[PDB]
Each structure stands twice: as structure tokens, then as C-alpha cells.
């Protein structure tokens, strides 16, 4: 094929955040050279001499525009001298799988076509996320580099006639005009490399007995029409032995079936209705690219993501990987409940409180200091890859159920009776105007930082709350030395309870206030009650010191989790 | 997994024939330790110090018993010290694919569970074919050493508890007692490695234009329910774009649908009748393990296997592989017609007449002296692997058709006019009485050695046949040094015509007299007339000169090919 040089006109808004470049599908399709300029910038950060012996892993969640985005990446990678492209079959490749294949075949990096839980289709979103050699997402130093080139780009090289058949497995070789070495495209089976990794981390024999035996565990997995569908079928139904009716919605639809692939009780309300009937012992829901999960137990019993990282850490050695590799350390994001801390302190293992964002967990994994990590936003993982893994959290839960012979409910009741219950809730204030939310945060910060606020007592019913610590979260990363200031206002009470405020939506007229309430309760009689009824006294106090209603006009949150 | 040693009793009839151990399924499942002893004998030929770093490839055509036998190969190969086994998914792997994979991954050899053109099922045939490092079948020195061990084996080693699942792709590792290194079973896709090899041999673009473009060559490919099924759908249908309706009987059945998987005019009768409708331009059928093929043109136009090698050799440069590799030499088996010979002599390329049974061609291929070869038993191939390849011959005919743009009947009319027509037909005289057959052969042998025989003139209807050479065919292989004598009575005439006698019998049921007629014709008009009438003179002369019906009682040929 021939290598053509196209003279282009640069764009100012192609700034890749740590989730890559997420935009509307109509933007990439209408803006001439939009996807082509960004794809060319990604390969331009790769040294020209490093390209011929370099491999790029490409894959996506199967949403609308993904097939044409992969075909564009092939034409540009070839014309730029990239030696080999490992593409998943039909372009399908889950985010945890892209991280597994990059580390397995020593790839220089990978391009993941996905907007995560963000909707797909002609009127949905589309994103291009770049991962580097360690399998993790590209860091700021690299995303800034891609941004500088995407806005100064005068030209881009492309092979217009190069057309690869994405549905056929195997190697495809293309000869480029007058070029001595051939361009190679390797189409891999979407699930195989990822399933071989899990087969070593877990005990697929104890699990086969658990899922398909006579006295077996009856599960129900909702893949939400996203990229984790084929992975549930091939691993949980085919190899582990669970009946095909266990894996529900396991077929990737380009529009996710007009639904949002996000693991939460309202977006995954169908699973919640299937679990109330009492027919199944374990239920689980996933996201677009399969790197997050929602664990449900019998009769609808919701397992909070913060309590889930504490259950796996309390039963970590029932998983073969950890028994052989050892637990190098535990970690959680600052807003995540204190349930993990109880376990890490009793087990005498290192605990790390990091700011929101997977990169902080990656830095500690690459430095051999982090084994298990959790986020309150449905996220659990481990140093097996450099991204979050929804299906790994589910097989880790099924491993604990098989080792203990107990129900999801009895394992958590047992956990709260040993460490105590960290009642957790997150209040989301969605389309809030910037000036009222920013002023609210500055006032609360000036109030907290008063020389007498530490020691102050708040009371909203029976128990009283004494403030022992009050600060605006600041983290110094021990690996790259970075200093992440202004990460969240924390009111830490002497009984272990916390109230956290986070302004997520910052640089925009529509700001988003995230309010996290964490109430610790060692009282064995109070541990089995409704979290909103026990958290009411501490929520009322958060609303009073923040003057939230007064600064935002909000008498109620948009979403409660 | 445990390693136990089973004491056994040896068998006198476990003799590996030229194409492996072909035998009725009844002997394999009824006789205790039958398959176990032969599999252990094959693995015993592997020097102990070389077993850990040795890989064996395993796969079969999918017939009855193939799955239980593969589970026996895994346990015995693991307990014997073999470090790695590469098996096709579900155990399904065609003979040409097994040869491709062995040569590609540098395997020590491979064990193919297939009885080829023999039928399968509870009351059918079974067979364990052993191939060596070069990808081809095990030579006499190796098959005979396996026979010497099976004849005297006193015990075998086995891991009873080991049970791998052929359905799941990927790497599976198992730990054996007192073994520092783990056992590896690598399940590979049945078509991938094989499709990549054909993708570098033929131009898949021109072929996609031929089968899916405006003209659309309406083909019909019958897989006879054997192993080539998945290979036809994945390569000819999905990749090259041929409408699913073209792939008839492409699903591997353990009983082959209650029929012989043999591509000849008697067993592949359905496909011929469907071709005689006039709708399709090209038709083809394959056998059990997939190394054979039957070529049909519009209206049922049968392309004789001996002429088919000559066509591919006359237009051999239409295929990219031979353009870049060149032609080291042509070869055929002695019984096969002289059509290829007429083509070989029209060029500066060597020609080899070899004894029937593919193993002879391999020796010429390893010494880089053979590029294209074929046998009148519907077998065609090339140095690209060390086995025959029916799907290769089909894509080679589709390559010739895309270059020529003519119909299968016109390509052969042009061929028969340029080199003349070598009329060929196969008269198999089934089960005759031993004394009458040996005497007929001895009588005609002495008659062919009469001092006044060469130069004598035969005459029947229109052609006068003068004897130029008359001998009893014997072979000296240039690589192994062996001398195979009395292979067949060759009555040769100076015009280019020939008659062949191959008395293949047994000290059991009876003796078969294989009559091959090779009537060469060079007249522009007579060549387009029916083979049965045009061959008539040489057929009567063979009967009158050998006194056939006279010493055998056979007035009509039992088999006709
Ligand atoms: O045994 P014979 O003498 O009748 O030999 C016949 O069958 C053998 C097995 O065929 P395959 O390689 O397809 O399994 C062939 O190689 C040989 O060409 C043919 O003459």
C-alpha cells in the first residue's frame, strides 16, 4: 500500500484527561481530521527509531464509531512506521484485558476506544484513552505532550488503501511503498490472554465445584450490554461451568441497549428486581469497559464498595495469587469508608490513604508497596494489572464464598461483628452553579481552619461528635514526588467517623458537590440497621457546618449512594 | 497430579502402517490397554533427556473415540515427562494444520487421531497417525521402532487424575508429583496458524474479488462432515466472502453423517448431481483429515487428479508463493498419469516418478528438490508443508481461475490441446483368488520380458500401439538409500501411451488387481471425446495381453475412479 502525507489544521480542545479524550460521537464524525489529528499525536510522542520494533495494543468496548476509529488507528500507525498492532477480535477488548496484554507482550502502550460508563450510540459519547508500557493510563507528563502536538500539528501521515479484516483471527502482513520491513497486524481472541491471567490468580477448580456442582451456588451476572459480556460467557459459563441463564445481557451492543453501563442500584435496577425473589445467592453488575463492579447478595442485600474492599482484605489469603505473591500493602481513596483501615490495622499491614484517581494506586504498585486497593465509586483491584477490574472483584468474592461456605449476608454480618460497621453514604449535588459551591467550600475551609475548631462538639440526637482533625487533603506521592493539594475537606471525629466534602466539577459554570458521610458503629445491636437511619445525625451536622442549602438552594441531593 | 505405573500385556498386531495405525474402533475400545500401549510406544521413541523441552501437537478429524484417545495422550505424555502439548480446540485439528503447526513452532512431532478417507462412528474405523519434526508422517525406521516396542512393552506410565478441557483456549498448567517443572497444555484455535500460512501463500485479495465481486464465481464446497468444515467457513466464507450457501456439510460429525469422508465420484455423488444442475461454476469436496480434494467444473465436469497437478503446474506462477520461491522440481507417484510429465518436460525443471504413499515426496522436499506434487488418489500439495492439502489445491484452482477468467472446462481444453490428453481411469479389481492373480502377473511379466516384445505392434479400432519400454517398476530414494522393487507392471508404448498393473493383495481376505490406464492422445479432434470410448483399445489390450477375465473370472471392473 502507499503512505500518503495529509496537510491538516490543528484543534485547541483535544486535551486528554487521565480518562483519555472523551467527546460526543458527532464531534469526532463532523470535525474533519479530529480523530486523525489526535491518533497521529499519540504515535508522534513515540520516538521515530523506537517505532519499527514497537507493538501497540488496540481495543474498545464495541460502542458506535469504535470500528471506524480502529480502522483509522491502523492506517496512521502503519504510515508512521509502527511495526505491529495487536488488535482484539472485531476490535473488542476490555480495559482490564488491554492492561493484561500490554504487560504480557511488553507493548510500548495501547489505545483503548471507550468512554467507560458514559453512554454510546450516534447521540452518546466516544473517547480515545492512551495507556503506556506498564499497562497503566498515560500520566500528566505524557498527556501534556500529546496535547502540545495535537494543537501544533501541521500534517499527519496515513495509508488510505490499508483495510484490515477485524473479525478474522491471526496475523495479517502489509507491504508499504519501497519499505524494507513489513507492517504486521495481529488479531487476538478478545478473552484468551485475559482468561489465562485469571486462571493463575484464582482457583478455577474450587470455583468449578462452587458454580456447577450438585449443592452449587446460584449466581446472576448483568454485563449491561457492555464489553465485559463475552468475558462473562467464556470464563464464568463455558470454563467455570455456570448455566448460560447465569450470564444475563452478556452481548455487546453498540448503544449498550439504550442504557448506561454503570454498576449502581438504579442503572442496574433489573438485577436488583431479580435478586429480591430469593432465587439466587449472588448477583453482580458491570460497566462499559468492565473495570468497575456492583456486588449484590441474596434477597437484594446490597454490598457497599467500601465494605467490599474490607471483606476481600480480611479474607485475602483465600485467593491463590496473594498466598504465593504475598500482601505488599493495602490502599484506598480518601473519600472511601474507613472499613479497610480496621482490617489493615488488625492484620498489621501498611494502609495508604490516597486522593481520588487510579494513578496514585499505580505508582504504589510499580514501587512494590501496594497489593489490594479500593474506591467508594465501585472499584476494587490489585497489582495483577495497572487498571481496575470488575470481573476480578467478582471472582475474588466467589473465591471467598467457596472458601467460607457462608452466604454474602452472613460474611458481612460476621465482618461487622469483628471490626465494627463503618456506615457509608455519598450525597451527589449534580448541576450546581460554580459561585455558590466555591463560596461554600471557602467558607467551610476558613471555618475548619480556626485554631479552636479542633475539639468542638456537635450533637444531633443520642451520640455526640468531637472534631479531632480538620484539613484540606494534601498528598505527597512517594514514587514521582508529586504534591496533590486541595483534594477534599475532611472533618475527622474522635470516634473514627468522618464527614468529607469534595468539589468534583471545578472549572465550569455547572459544579458538582460530592458529600461523603462515614459513621463508625462498634455497637453490635446498631450494626444491622438502615445506613440512612443511622447516618441521619451525622448528615444533619454536615449540612449545618457547610451551610449547603444556603449556598446552593438544594433541599435534597440529586443522587444518594 | 499423581504419576502411577500400570503393568500391561503386549500386542502382536499393533503394526503402524505407512499412514499410521488404521484399525476398526472396536479393537481400540474393546481390547484392554490397546490405545494406551500404542500411545506410550510412540512417546517412548523420544530420548528421556529431550522430553522436558519437547512439544507435541495433538488433534484429529473429530470422528467417534477421538476425544477419549486425546485424554489418554495428555495423561500418558504428562506422566512420561513431555513438558508441553499443543492441542487444537475441542481436539479438532486437520492433517495439513498439524503439519503447519509442527513446522511453525519447531515441535518434536505430532500425534494425529485420524483414519482419513476411512468412515467413523461406533461401527467405523479409527487410527493413530504419528508425524515427525519436519511436519510429515513418521518414516519406516520410526514406525518400525514403534512396532518393535509395542510388540514387547511390559508397562506404561500414566496420570489418571489429570483431565484437561479441550473446549477452552489458552495456556493450562498442571503440577505432577516429584516434578520440578509443571506440565503445559496449550489449546490453540483450529484454523488461526493454518489461515496465516495460506494468507502468505495465496493472494487473498484477488480471491475475495473472485468470490464476492460483480462476476461472483458461484462455488460449492462439500466438507463431507469431516474436519475441513471449520476451515471452509472461516477461510472461504468469512474471510474471502463466499456466501454461506457455498459451504455444504461443513460441520464435523463423529459418524461423518453415516458416510465415507472420501472425495471420489462414487461417495461424493450428491455434490456431482448438484453440480450437474448447471448453476455453479466450480465445485469441490474434501476427505476425513482434510489432506485430499475432488475438483468439479460447471455441469459436473470432473477434473481427474492426475490432470489437476498438470494444470496447477502449467499455470503455477499465478500463485505468489511460487513466484517468490521458484520451482525446485515436480513429482508424482508411478500409478498417476503422464499429464504432469508432459508439463515438466516442457520446462528446464526436474521430474520424479515416486512409489505411491506421500512419505517419498517429503524426502525430495527436505532436500529442496520438490515444489509441486500430486497423486491420482485425489491428493495435491507443495513444499509449503510436509503433508497433502486439499484446501490448498482448492485455493490454487481459485487462483488460476481469477488469473485466467475462463471456466474450469476451458482451462482443461486449452491444457489438453497444448500438451495433449493423458486419458486416465482407475479399474480396481477387488478381492480375487491368490494363485490366479500371482500367475496372471507372472505370465504377463515373462511376456513383457520376451526378447521380441519391445518393438512388437498392438492394434485395436483406431490406434496401433508399439511397445517402447516394458518393465517392473522399482525405486531408489536419493535421501534414505532404500530400493522398493516389483512396484507395478508398466506396459509403455512409443507414442506416449501406458498401462499399469498394481497387484495389491493380503494373506487374509483376498488380492486386489489395480488396473491404471494412461492413454495419451495428441490429435486436436479426438481429445474432446468421452474417456470410456477413447481408452477402450488400451483397456482391451490390457485384458487380452494379461488374459484377465480368463484367469480371474472378472468380466467387469468392481471399482472405477
Ligand atoms: O494404502 P494405499 O496403498 O492404498 O495408499 C493409498 O492411501 C494412502 C493414505 O492416504 P492419506 O494420506 O490421505 O491418509 C495414500 O497416501 C496413497 O496415496 C494411496 O495410494
Amino acid at each position: 500500500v502507499k503512505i500518503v502525507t495529509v496537510k491538516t489544521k490543528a484543534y485547541p480542545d483535544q486535551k486528554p484527561g487521565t480518562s483519555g479524550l472523551r467527546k460526543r460521537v458527532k464531534v469526532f464524525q463532523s470535525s474533519t481530521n479530529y480523530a486523525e489529528n489526535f491518533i497521529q499525536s499519540i504515535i508522534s510522542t513515540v520516538e521515530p527509531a523506537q517505532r519499527q520494533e514497537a507493538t501497540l495494543v488496540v481495543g474498545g468496548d464495541g460502542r458506535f464509531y469504535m470500528k471506524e476509529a480502529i480502522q483509522l488507528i491502523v492506517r496512521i500507525a502503519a504510515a508512521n512506521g509502527i511495526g505491529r498492532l495487536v488488535i482484539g477480535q472485531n476490535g473488542i477488548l476490555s480495559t482490564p484485558a488491554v492492561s493484561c496484554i500490554i504487560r504480557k507482550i511488553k507493548a510500548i502502550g495501547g489505545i483503548i476506544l471507550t468512554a467507560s460508563h458514559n453512554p454510546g450510540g450516534p447521540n452518546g459519547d466516544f473517547g480515545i484513552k492512551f495507556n503506556i508500557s506498564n499497562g497503566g493510563p498515560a500520566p500528566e507528563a505524557i498527556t501534556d505532550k500529546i496535547f502540545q502536538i495535537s494543537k501544533t500539528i501541521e500534517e499527519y501521515a496515513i495509508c488510505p488503501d490499508l483495510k484490515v479484516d477485524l473479525g478474522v483471527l491471526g496475523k495479517q502482513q502489509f507491504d508499504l511503498e519501497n519499505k524494507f520491513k513489513p507492517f504486521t497486524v495481529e488479531i487476538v481472541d478478545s478473552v484468551e490472554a485475559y482468561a489465562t491471567m485469571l486462571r493463575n490468580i484464582f482457583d478455577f477448580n474450587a470455583l468449578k465445584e462452587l458454580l456447577s456442582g450438585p449443592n452449587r451456588l446460584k449466581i446472576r451476572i448483568d454485563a449491561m450490554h457492555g464489553v465485559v459480556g463475552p468475558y462473562v460467557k467464556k470464563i464464568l459459563c463455558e470454563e467455570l461451568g455456570a448455566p448460560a441463564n447465569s450470564a444475563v445481557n452478556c452481548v455487546p451492543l453498540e448503544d449498550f441497549g439504550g442504557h448506561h453501563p454503570d454498576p449502581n442500584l438504579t442503572y442496574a435496577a433489573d438485577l436488583v428486581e431479580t435478586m429480591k425473589s430469593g432465587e439466587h445467592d449472588f448477583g453482580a453488575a458491570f460497566d462499559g469497559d468492565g473495570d468497575r463492579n456492583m456486588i449484590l447478595g441474596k434477597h437484594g442485600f446490597f454490598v457497599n464498595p467500601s465494605d467490599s474492599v474490607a471483606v476481600i482484605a480480611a479474607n485475602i489469603f483465600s485467593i491463590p495469587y496473594f498466598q504465593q505473591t504475598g500482601v505488599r500493602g493495602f490502599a484506598r481513596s480518601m473519600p472511601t469508608s474507613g472499613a479497610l483501615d480496621r482490617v489493615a490495622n488488625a492484620t498489621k499491614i501498611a494502609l495508604y490513604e490516597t486522593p481520588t484517581g487510579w494513578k496514585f494506586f499505580g505508582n504504589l504498585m510499580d514501587a512494590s508497596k501496594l497489593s489490594l486497593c479500593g474506591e467508594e465509586s465501585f472499584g476494587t483491584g490489585s497489582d495483577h494489572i495497572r487498571e481496575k477490574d470488575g470481573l476480578w472483584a467478582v471472582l475474588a468474592w466467589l473465591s471467598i464464598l467457596a472458601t467460607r461456605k457462608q452466604s454474602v449476608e452472613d460474611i458481612l454480618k460476621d465482618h461487622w461483628h469483628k471490626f465494627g460497621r463503618n456506615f457509608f453514604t455519598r450525597y451527589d449535588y449534580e448541576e450546581v452553579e460554580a459561585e455558590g459551591a466555591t463560596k461554600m467550600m471557602k467558607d467551610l475551609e476558613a471555618l475548619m481552619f480556626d485554631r479552636s475548631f479542633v475539639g468542638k462538639q456537635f450533637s444531633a440526637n443520642d451520640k455526640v461528635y468531637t472534631v479531632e482533625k480538620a484539613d484540606n487533603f494534601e498528598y505527597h506521592d512517594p514514587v514521582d514526588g508529586s504534591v496533590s493539594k486541595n483534594q477534599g475537606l475532611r472533618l475527622i471525629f474522635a470516634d473514627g467517623s468522618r464527614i468529607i466534602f469534595r468539589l468534583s466539577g471545578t472549572g465550569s459554570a455547572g459544579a458538582t458537590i460530592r458529600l461523603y458521610i462515614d459513621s463508625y458503629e462498634k455497637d453490635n445491636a446498631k450494626i444491622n440497621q438502615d445506613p440512612q437511619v443511622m447516618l441521619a445525625p451525622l448528615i444533619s451536622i454536615a449540612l449545618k457546618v457547610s451551610q449547603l442549602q444556603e449556598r446552593t438552594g438544594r433541599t435534597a441531593p440529586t443522587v444518594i449512594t
Side-chain angles (χ1 to χ4, degrees), chain A:
Chain A
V1 285
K2 50 159 160 44
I3 294 174
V4 158
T5 333
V6 182
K7 226 287 301 148
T8 192
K9 198 93 83 151
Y11 281 90
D13 65 328
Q14 290 185 144
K15 184 188 57 192
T18 41
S19 283
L21 178 79
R22 293 176 186 183
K23 301 265 166 156
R24 295 287 160 174
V25 178
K26 292 190 70 180
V27 175
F28 287 100
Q29 298 179 112
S30 67
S31 305
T32 280
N33 299 346
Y34 202 78
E36 294 101 304
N37 296 167
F38 193 55
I39 298 162
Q40 170 68 70
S41 304
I42 298 171
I43 295 127
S44 295
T45 69
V46 185
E47 313 291 323
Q50 275 193 54
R51 300 182 188 194
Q52 182 54 68
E53 307 301 76
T55 295
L56 272 178
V57 180
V58 182
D61 53 12
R63 74 175 58 216
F64 192 80
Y65 194 67
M66 192 200 64
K67 234 71 65 192
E68 193 183 6
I70 299 168
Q71 207 50 238
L72 286 181
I73 298 170
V74 184
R75 317 250 231 277
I76 300 171
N80 272 272
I82 300 292
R84 171 174 65 139
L85 286 188
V86 175
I87 310 179
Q89 191 179 27
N90 292 106
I92 294 286
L93 211 63
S94 81
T95 294
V98 183
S99 173
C100 170
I101 299 179
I102 294 176
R103 298 164 64 70
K104 180 166 171 159
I105 66 179
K106 308 307 186 82
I108 231 163
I111 296 176
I112 320 178
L113 291 313
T114 177
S116 181
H117 61 130
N118 297 24
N123 296 261
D125 295 289
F126 189 82
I128 302 170
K129 173 189 204 291
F130 184 42
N131 275 48
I132 55 166
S133 81
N134 73 340
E140 251 218 324
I142 299 304
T143 29
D144 286 315
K145 205 193 293 176
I146 307 182
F147 182 44
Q148 316 309 336
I149 304 172
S150 73
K151 65 193 213 289
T152 60
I153 184 175
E154 315 159 67
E155 273 198 296
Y156 71 88
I158 189 174
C159 287
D161 328 296
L162 214 160
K163 47 164 253 67
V164 177
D165 192 326
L166 267 63
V168 112
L169 247 52
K171 190 176 268 64
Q172 284 171 66
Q173 237 149 15
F174 304 85
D175 307 275
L176 317 169
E177 227 150 55
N178 309 348
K179 303 283 174 175
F180 199 88
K181 286 174 73 164
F183 173 53
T184 283
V185 172
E186 236 175 87
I187 300 195
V188 150
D189 177 68
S190 334
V191 185
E192 194 267 298
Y194 173 76
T196 300
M197 177 187 61
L198 292 190
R199 184 149 51 239
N200 290 255
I201 294 158
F202 300 104
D203 184 10
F204 282 33
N205 282 286
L207 291 182
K208 280 187 62 71
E209 211 80 89
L210 201 250
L211 301 181
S212 56
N215 36 2
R216 69 180 224 263
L217 201 76
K218 294 141 96 286
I219 67 169
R220 171 59 76 113
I221 310 300
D222 204 313
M224 299 173 118
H225 313 115
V227 82
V228 133
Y231 297 75
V232 178
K233 292 266 202 61
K234 293 231 192 159
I235 304 170
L236 282 153
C237 302
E238 289 180 30
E239 191 177 341
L240 292 183
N245 61 331
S246 296
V248 72
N249 291 298
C250 288
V251 173
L253 304 181
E254 299 195 285
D255 72 317
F256 301 82
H259 289 106
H260 294 213
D262 193 58
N264 76 51
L265 298 189
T266 51
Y267 276 131
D270 266 280
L271 219 201
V272 191
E273 190 168 29
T274 294
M275 299 296 310
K276 309 287 262 289
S277 62
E279 219 266 340
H280 311 90
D281 309 79
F282 181 90
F286 297 102
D287 60 323
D289 48 24
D291 95 319
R292 281 190 288 105
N293 61 293
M294 182 189 61
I295 304 305
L296 291 178
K298 206 157 180 146
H299 293 309
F301 186 82
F302 165 79
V303 178
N304 193 282
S306 282
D307 278 352
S308 190
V309 64
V311 176
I312 300 168
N315 300 262
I316 190 87
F317 291 120
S318 64
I319 298 169
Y321 180 72
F322 297 112
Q323 287 184 348
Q324 281 134 49
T325 197
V327 179
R328 266 65 66 104
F330 286 159
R332 60 158 178 92
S333 66
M334 182 264 299
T336 284
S337 109
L340 182 58
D341 306 74
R342 301 284 170 210
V343 176
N345 295 136
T347 297
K348 288 193 153 165
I349 249 291
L351 191 279
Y352 297 102
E353 190 156 30
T354 61
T356 59
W358 205 89
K359 35 265 147 193
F360 303 103
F361 297 137
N363 297 8
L364 296 182
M365 281 167 189
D366 294 18
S368 298
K369 304 308 315 301
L370 176 53
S371 290
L372 181 84
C373 70
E375 259 173 358
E376 60 83 32
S377 39
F378 298 92
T380 312
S382 78
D383 62 319
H384 74 283
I385 51 165
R386 296 291 103 109
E387 290 267 47
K388 283 134 62 225
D389 205 336
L391 198 48
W392 179 94
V394 173
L395 292 182
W397 249 109
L398 289 170
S399 298
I400 290 160
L401 284 164
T403 303
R404 296 189 57 143
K405 277 80 199 60
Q406 283 179 289
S407 70
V408 181
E409 189 177 71
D410 296 326
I411 291 175
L412 269 171
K413 289 204 202 84
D414 191 277
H415 190 93
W416 300 332
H417 180 98
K418 257 108 263 161
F419 302 103
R421 183 165 188 182
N422 271 75
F423 282 99
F424 190 79
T425 196
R426 197 230 285 144
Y427 275 29
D428 288 314
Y429 297 87
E430 235 101 78
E431 307 298 335
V432 144
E433 79 99 351
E435 192 183 315
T438 310
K439 214 198 100 48
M440 188 217 97
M441 298 297 288
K442 289 158 81 123
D443 291 2
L444 187 62
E445 183 175 2
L447 200 162
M448 286 169 50
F449 284 139
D450 194 280
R451 76 287 171 179
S452 45
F453 192 62
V454 173
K456 186 142 173 57
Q457 300 192 346
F458 295 90
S459 194
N461 199 291
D462 153 77
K463 192 175 59 165
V464 181
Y465 293 92
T466 308
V467 178
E468 72 147 58
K469 186 144 165 49
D471 69 64
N472 193 346
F473 202 56
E474 179 175 325
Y475 182 85
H476 308 88
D477 191 79
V479 174
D480 49 31
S482 162
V483 183
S484 295
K485 294 211 203 71
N486 199 62
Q487 292 302 302
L489 294 167
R490 301 139 81 214
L491 283 70
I492 308 171
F493 300 96
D495 66 306
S497 292
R498 294 167 298 143
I499 282 179
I500 310 116
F501 290 88
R502 274 193 78 244
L503 196 63
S504 52
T506 43
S508 157
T512 335
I513 307 174
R514 319 213 97 107
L515 174 49
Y516 313 84
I517 309 300
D518 175 24
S519 181
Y520 179 74
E521 190 69 66
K522 190 66 132 188
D523 194 294
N524 281 219
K526 298 196 192 81
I527 64 167
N528 278 284
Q529 298 224 115
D530 188 278
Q532 296 305 297
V533 168
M534 306 301 305
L535 284 159
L538 206 50
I539 297 170
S540 162
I541 290 168
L543 299 163
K544 290 184 209 295
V545 285
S546 67
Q547 288 286 272
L548 195 141
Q549 188 187 280
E550 289 95 319
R551 303 285 140 249
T552 70
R554 297 293 163 84
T555 57
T558 311
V559 168
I560 294 180
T561 302

